[PDB]
RNA sequence: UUCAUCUAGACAGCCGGACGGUGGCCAUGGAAGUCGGAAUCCGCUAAGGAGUGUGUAACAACUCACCGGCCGAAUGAACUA
RNA sequence: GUGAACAGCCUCUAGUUGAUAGAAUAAUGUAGAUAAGGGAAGUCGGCAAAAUAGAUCCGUAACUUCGGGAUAAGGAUUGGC
RNA sequence: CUCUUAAGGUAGCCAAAUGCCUCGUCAUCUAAUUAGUGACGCGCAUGAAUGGAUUAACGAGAUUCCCACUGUCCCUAUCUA
RNA sequence: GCAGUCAAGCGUUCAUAGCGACAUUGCUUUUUGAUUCUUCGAUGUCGGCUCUUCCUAUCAUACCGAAGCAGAAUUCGGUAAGCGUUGGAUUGUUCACCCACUAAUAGGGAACGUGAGCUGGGUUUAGACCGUCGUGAGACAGGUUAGUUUUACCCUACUGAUGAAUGUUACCGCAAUAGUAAUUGAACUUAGUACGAGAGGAACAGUUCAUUCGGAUAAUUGGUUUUUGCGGCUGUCUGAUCAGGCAUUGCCGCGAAGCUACCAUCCGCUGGAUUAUGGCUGAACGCCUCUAAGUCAGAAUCCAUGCUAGAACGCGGUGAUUUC
């Protein structure tokens, strides 16, 4: 008989299967679409989510009741240190899919993303890339060569590049490599850029700019195994039930005389691959950048670096990309940001944000005071010290 | 015309009635606009209009279903600008299907939202928040 | 935006920091926590704990 | 509502200059006049009042739309009106309308004010006693 | 399969006429071909129904049967499986 | 000892330290709890849970077999020195 | 006025744990009630120690409503063993 | 139960806007019958809750054709199952009825889906009362009350999680295949405009929100307390103090972290091909004709862009590859 009330479904089946994924970065699996007459530019960055805090900024939504006043919103963190070129990949279309063609790395390596290539690095003797590195013995014509076949084929074009993580609070001390689409025409000037950019730095700035909307890549925070009750929103069985009521009740018919997929069932919950679209940057802050956390209409000098530090990361000394709202991902994870794969135009984006003030006091609780100097200023003399 | 308001009044609900009309106080039996859901209780919150009865009042008033505009919530809700507020108790007012008062005079503070809805609430009140 | 101040212990209040409430009689209360707040409920008296600005004043601590 | 359903008298004081008052073929004396202006409702359901309205004045300001012409009420006010022996006065309103909606470049508008008083003269023509 | 029109000009196409006795009789508040019952006529006729429809309160005004003008060779209808 | 008390809790004499253990703290359970706003809208059904609770003082209805109902209901107080 | 019995259900009571029709009719209770209560009674098939009716008090008896109360629920979440 | 053919008539005229008699052709297996083929060394028998999928005989939403379509509203129909289809009073109930919101509160199957998923209100053991029937034991699709819902650790299915082998190991990638997602409403403006005598009363574009769903996230707010973190309190014990033990976490107030809440916040993409349909040229059939050749636009459709997983016997690139 009929389920004689109707409900919507319980989860989303287009992110099936809810395991856990590959790796702790998340796969780009979508680059925006080549413009070739736009210059040569990254389409993606690496950061690491750093945390969360809240801004003070004017509205500004014509038509809305509340146009033109302030709006208190939360915005998620994320360190952004200057990512190192240190490869160029080339891809050749085939009937078969994309196939990387091959790939040119650059002359010297930091221990930094030597060390991805070890699970032992204490250990180990180091010889990562030593006959590759001879490549470049007089004049690199192994490279050159090499460089020319990517120019002669490999309709795409991408660059290795790889977080500079001991620059940040984190005691992973191993890089994560990531390769980034070079979008922009002329091929050949992509491997020029590439070849050009070995060994050298891109920073967030010439990437991401204020007010952009931007898509957050990252691997959820995992919790292990999960009940249908929370795993999938399914409703909680009556206090009545035996054997249990944090259950779902019919698993299947008798026909067809098995479990189906669509049916919620007990496993793994989070650590799965999100790609989150549509959040805007409400800053870009340098870290040499000192009072990074002021704004135009505040100037105090403090830096985005919350009271004693991000809860569970640190404190903030790099390039940072603050997103309006949340990220997939938790605290200390690698995430990837990349552009708009289209060209959004509905007034909340081509909004430009102005902030008032930003928030911080410390996460480590019921934060009272933005700064030390006002802590001082509140509570005047103390015993210990001031 | 409103921002989405923490509902704090489902179903069942029975509220303080804010006007002069004789009425004690308000019992919620159904929102306007409110959504459908299986098992989901219909729930409203501040400046919602409502179908009520009442339970204490003025004999007339009492056996038959009115509108109502909610004034107070006391559910604590969160304001685009950070604030979280709510009031001391629930609190409505009886008004006819196009948001006009039955009664002549409110009775304790209104919302924001409610005023900015129906002006004839407004209108009837005195201090806002 | 401006910096209100906690109605119960005199802490400053950032923006969509605490919580506000209305009494009947339409006065506003703003809290910086939910510590003053369950004070305020509790009906405890500001002159009378030990950490509030006010019985700072009255008692003549930090001047 | 939005609409009017009674008939009100107002009082108005009007001053002139002494030019178009020798431009007046009639006796008169002065330079001011008083105004006892009745505001009739346009609605055939209160077409009576109209009446009492016509039979306590002298004059008809009749009032017409360039856009919708002469319509039915137009047609019925102005027939008591010369029923009572009133003599009218015709004023083509919403021209304004006429010149953000109907996008008239030269001629369409004088066509529609002379197709206008043309339907009017007929009107009072037929219906007005020698 | 059967029956019809057809170089003495078939069908289709486009264009012209579609009258007079006469607003036929009776009814109808009005009924003039065209709300109705009945009468389904005559003359001029290449031809026109006491009308094929639209339409008017009733007239009117178009339209169609009907006959012609242009082209010149096939065409139409009803059934069978 | 607290306490009206052989109530519950702690201690003195006496007795025992006997139940296979170690490591983590997923789901779902068993047992114990808490939860903003609403307050039975859940459900066959207030099932389960919560709320009340001792003592002192005030006050206590309908009905009644005059014996009760009755701790009716409804209230106020309680520490230490 | 009849047919008819041993006598033809009296006092009482009822859609009652007894009424099919039936979710009976009216009133009240609710926003809405096959529930509850108060009435009516040609009552399938109520009824007088096969005891009728009414009863204070009592009941881990069945049912209805109200206040309070609360995760029963909106809508779930967290913690401990 | 649903759908057709003919058209005497209804519909002011007018068989076919909408209907449609006398007849007649069918479809379906959510009705109930008919039968007794399977099951009596036993398929757990109603209803509700929960959850998934499927059908379309489509209530709403998308785009349209027709009207006895002026507007609004409404009615008939087409492509269409993508996406929704509720909260409650009574009753075990399915069903029914009413209140109310809603865009709508469409109909159904999946062993009349679903009891080793629950519950047990009903039916349907044994106890008990009443009415009727019976001399009686007892009978009642007559009413009422109480009445044990057992087992998974096996295989498969599903959800997750490892894993030998392809020289080893490590990194960066491709995407065959499989899944897929967004839904709907309100307000302002157009505009009191089109239309209409009037009453009334739109629609395209644009803007701000909201409903349902989904995925994350904890800046703030709320909750959570074994942080047994601080303080307070009671009883007892350590001679008193200080400091504490016990009261199965002794209780109370606050409480950071983590978890978590439409109880909190953020986000949820745009191109093509098509259906119905409306058309272009143009024969068939000197005319006509959206159709026959050909062709334009066009739906919540479909396929793509995008998102998820990465074939563990699909693949590529790249680094190092055991002086002993
Ligand atoms: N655009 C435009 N609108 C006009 C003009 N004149 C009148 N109107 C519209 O016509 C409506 C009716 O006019 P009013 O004067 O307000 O009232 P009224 O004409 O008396 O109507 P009733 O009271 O019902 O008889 C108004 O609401 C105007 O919007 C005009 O000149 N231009
Ligand atoms: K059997
Ligand atoms: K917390
Ligand atoms: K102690
Ligand atoms: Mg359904
Ligand atoms: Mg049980
Ligand atoms: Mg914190
Ligand atoms: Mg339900
Ligand atoms: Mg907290
Ligand atoms: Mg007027
Ligand atoms: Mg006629
Ligand atoms: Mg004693
Ligand atoms: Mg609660
Ligand atoms: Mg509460
Ligand atoms: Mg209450
Ligand atoms: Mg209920
Ligand atoms: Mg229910
Ligand atoms: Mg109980
Ligand atoms: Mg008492
Ligand atoms: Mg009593
Ligand atoms: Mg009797
Ligand atoms: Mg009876
Ligand atoms: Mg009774
Ligand atoms: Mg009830
Ligand atoms: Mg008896
Ligand atoms: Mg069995
Ligand atoms: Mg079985
Ligand atoms: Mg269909
Ligand atoms: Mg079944
Ligand atoms: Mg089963
Ligand atoms: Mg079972
Ligand atoms: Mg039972
Ligand atoms: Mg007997
Ligand atoms: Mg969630
Ligand atoms: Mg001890
Ligand atoms: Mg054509
Ligand atoms: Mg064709
Ligand atoms: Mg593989």
Same mark, same amino acid.
């Not at chain 1, 010297?108 to 204490?122: A, C, G, I, M, P």
């Given at each position: 008989?009929?389920?004689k009330?109707?409900?919507?479904?319980?989860?989303?089946l287009?992110?099936?299967?809810?395991?856990?994924?590959?790796?702790?970065?998340?796969?780009?699996?979508?680059?925006?679409?080549?413009?070739?007459?736009?210059?040569?530019?990254?389409?993606?960055?690496?950061?690491?989510?750093?945390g969360?805090t809240?801004? =003070?900024?004017d509205?500004?939504?014509?038509?809305?009741?509340?146009?033109?006043?302030?709006?208190?919103?939360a915005?998620?963190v994320?360190?952004?240190?200057?990512?190192?070129? =240190?490869?160029?990949?080339?891809?050749?279309?085939?009937?078969?899919?994309?196939?990387?063609?091959?790939?040119?790395?650059?002359?010297?390596?930091?221990?930094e993303v030597?060390?991805?290539?070890?699970?032992?690095?204490?250990?180990?003797?180091?010889?990562?890339?030593?006959?590759?590195?001879?490549?470049?013995?007089q004049?690199?014509?192994?490279?050159?060569?090499?460089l020319?076949?990517?120019?002669?084929?490999?309709?795409?074009?991408?660059?290795? =590049?790889?977080?500079?993580?001991?620059?940040?609070?984190?005691?992973?001390?191993?890089?994560?490599?990531?390769?980034?689409?070079?979008?922009?025409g002329?091929?050949?000037?992509?491997?020029?850029?590439?070849?050009?950019?070995?060994?050298?730095?891109?920073?967030?700035?010439?990437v991401?700019?204020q007010?952009?909307?931007?898509?957050?890549?990252a691997?959820?925070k995992?919790?292990?195994?999960?009940?249908?009750?929370?795993?999938?929103?399914?409703?909680?069985?009556?206090?009545?039930?035996?054997?249990?009521?944090?259950?779902?009740?019919?698993?299947?018919a008798?026909?067809?005389?098995?479990?189906?997929?669509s049916?919620?069932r007990?496993?793994?919950?989070?650590?799965?691959?999100?790609?989150?679209?549509?959040?805007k940057?409400?800053?870009?802050?340098?870290?040499?950048?000192?009072?990074?956390?002021?704004?135009?209409?505040?100037?105090?000098?403090?830096?985005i670096?919350?009271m004693?530090?991000?809860?569970?990361?640190?404190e903030?000394?790099?390039?940072?990309?603050?997103?309006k709202?949340?990220?997939?991902?938790?605290?200390?994870?690698?995430?990837?940001?990349?552009?708009?794969?289209?060209?959004?135009?509905?007034?909340?984006?081509?909004?430009?944000?102005?902030?008032?003030?930003?928030?911080?006091?410390?996460?480590?609780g019921?934060?009272r005071?933005?700064?030390?100097?006002?802590?001082?200023?509140?509570?005047?003399?103390?015993?210990?010290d001031? | 015309?409103?921002?989405?308001?923490?509902?704090?009044?489902?179903?069942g609900?029975?509220?303080?009635? $804010?006007?002069?009309?004789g $009425?004690?106080?308000?019992?919620?039996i159904?929102?306007?606009?409110?959504?459908?859901?299986l098992?989901?209780?219909?729930?409203?919150?501040?400046?919602?209009?409502?179908?009520?009865?009442?339970?204490?009042?003025?004999?007339?008033?009492?056996?038959?279903?009115?509108?109502?505009?909610?004034?107070?919530?006391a559910?604590?809700?969160?304001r685009?600008?950070?604030?979280?507020?709510?009031?001391e108790?629930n609190?409505?007012?009886? $008004?006819?299907?196009?948001?006009?008062?039955?009664?002549?005079?409110?009775?304790?503070?209104?919302?924001?939202?409610?005023?900015?809805?129906?002006?004839?609430? $407004?209108?009837?009140?005195?201090?806002?928040? | 935006?401006?910096?209100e101040?906690?109605?119960f212990?005199?802490?400053?209040?950032?923006?969509?920091?605490g919580?506000?409430?209305?009494?009947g009689?339409?006065?506003?209360?703003?809290?910086?926590?939910?510590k003053?707040?369950?004070?305020?409920?509790?009906?405890?008296?500001?002159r009378?704990?030990?950490?509030?600005?006010?019985?700072?004043?009255?008692?003549?601590?930090?001047? | 509502?939005?609409?009017?359903?009674?008939?009100?008298?107002?009082?108005?004081?009007?001053?002139?200059?002494?030019?178009?008052?020798?431009?007046?073929?009639?006796?008169?004396?002065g330079?001011?006049?008083?105004?006892?202006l009745?505001?009739?409702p346009?609605?055939?359901?209160?077409?009576?009042?109209?009446?009492?309205?016509?039979?306590?004045?002298?004059?008809?300001?009749?009032?017409?739309?360039?856009?919708?012409?002469?319509?039915?009420?137009?047609?019925?006010?102005?027939?008591?009106?010369?029923?009572?022996?009133?003599?009218?006065?015709?004023?083509?309103?919403?021209?304004?309308?006429?010149?953000?909606?109907?996008?008239?470049?030269?001629?369409?508008?004088?066509?529609?004010?002379?197709?206008?008083?043309?339907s009017?003269?007929?009107?009072?023509?037929?219906?007005a006693?020698?």
């Amino acid at each position: 008989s009929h389920r004689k009330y109707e409900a919507p479904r319980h989860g989303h089946l287009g992110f099936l299967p809810r395991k856990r994924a590959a790796s702790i970065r998340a796969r780009v699996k979508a680059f925006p679409k080549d413009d070739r007459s736009k210059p040569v530019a990254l389409t993606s960055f690496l950061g690491y989510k750093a945390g969360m805090t809240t801004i =003070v900024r004017d509205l500004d939504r014509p038509g809305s009741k509340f146009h033109k006043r302030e709006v208190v919103e939360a915005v998620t963190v994320v360190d952004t240190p200057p990512v190192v070129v =240190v490869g160029v990949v080339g891809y050749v279309e085939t009937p078969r899919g994309l196939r990387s063609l091959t790939t040119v790395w650059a002359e010297h390596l930091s221990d930094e993303v030597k060390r991805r290539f070890y699970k032992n690095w204490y250990k180990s003797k180091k010889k990562a890339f030593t006959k590759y590195s001879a490549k470049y013995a007089q004049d690199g014509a192994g490279i050159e060569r090499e460089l020319a076949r990517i120019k002669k084929y490999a309709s795409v074009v991408r660059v290795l =590049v790889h977080t500079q993580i001991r620059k940040t609070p984190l005691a992973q001390k191993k890089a994560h490599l990531a390769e980034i689409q070079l979008n922009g025409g002329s091929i050949s000037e992509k491997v020029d850029w590439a070849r050009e950019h070995f060994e050298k730095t891109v920073a967030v700035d010439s990437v991401f700019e204020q007010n952009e909307m931007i898509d957050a890549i990252a691997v959820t925070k995992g919790h292990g195994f999960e009940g249908v009750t929370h795993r999938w929103g399914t409703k909680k069985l009556p206090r009545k039930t035996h054997r249990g009521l944090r259950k779902v009740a019919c698993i299947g018919a008798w026909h067809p005389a098995h479990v189906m997929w669509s049916v919620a069932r007990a496993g793994q919950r989070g650590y799965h691959s999100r790609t989150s679209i549509n959040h805007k940057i409400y800053r870009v802050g340098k870290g040499d950048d000192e009072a990074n956390g002021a704004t135009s209409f505040d100037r105090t000098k403090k830096t985005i670096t919350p009271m004693g530090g991000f809860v569970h990361y640190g404190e903030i000394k790099n390039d940072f990309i603050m997103v309006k709202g949340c990220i997939p991902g938790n605290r200390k994870r690698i995430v990837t940001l990349r552009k708009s794969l289209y060209t959004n135009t509905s007034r909340k984006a081509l909004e430009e944000v102005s902030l008032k003030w930003i928030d911080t006091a410390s996460k480590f609780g019921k934060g009272r005071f933005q700064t030390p100097a006002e802590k001082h200023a509140f509570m005047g003399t103390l015993k210990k010290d001031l | 015309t409103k921002f989405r308001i923490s509902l704090g009044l489902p179903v069942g609900a029975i509220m303080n009635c $804010a006007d002069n009309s004789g $009425a004690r106080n308000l019992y919620i039996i159904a929102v306007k606009g409110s959504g459908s859901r299986l098992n989901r209780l219909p729930a409203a919150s501040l400046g919602d209009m409502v179908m009520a009865t009442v339970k204490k009042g003025k004999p007339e008033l009492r056996k038959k279903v009115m509108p109502a505009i909610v004034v107070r919530q006391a559910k604590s809700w969160r304001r685009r600008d950070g604030v979280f507020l709510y009031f001391e108790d629930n609190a409505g007012v009886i $008004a006819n299907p196009k948001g006009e008062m039955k009664g002549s005079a409110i009775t304790g503070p209104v919302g924001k939202e409610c005023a900015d809805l129906w002006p004839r609430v $407004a209108s009837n009140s005195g201090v806002v928040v | 935006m401006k910096v209100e101040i906690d109605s119960f212990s005199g802490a400053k209040i950032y923006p969509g920091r605490g919580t506000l409430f209305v009494r009947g009689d339409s006065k506003i209360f703003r809290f910086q926590n939910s510590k003053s707040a369950s004070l305020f409920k509790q009906r405890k008296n500001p002159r009378r704990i030990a950490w509030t600005v006010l019985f700072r004043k009255h008692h003549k601590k930090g001047i | 509502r939005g609409i009017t359903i009674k008939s009100t008298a107002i009082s108005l004081y009007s001053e002139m200059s002494d030019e178009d008052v020798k431009e007046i073929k009639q006796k008169t004396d002065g330079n001011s006049f008083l105004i006892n202006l009745i505001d009739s409702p346009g609605h055939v359901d209160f077409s009576s009042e109209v009446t009492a309205a016509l039979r306590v004045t002298d004059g008809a300001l009749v009032v017409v739309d360039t856009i919708e012409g002469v319509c039915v009420q137009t047609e019925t006010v102005l027939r008591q009106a010369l029923g009572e022996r009133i003599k009218p006065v015709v004023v083509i309103n919403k021209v304004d309308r006429a010149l953000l909606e109907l996008q008239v470049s030269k001629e369409d508008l004088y066509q529609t004010f002379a197709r206008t008083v043309e339907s009017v003269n007929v009107i009072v023509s037929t219906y007005a006693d020698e």
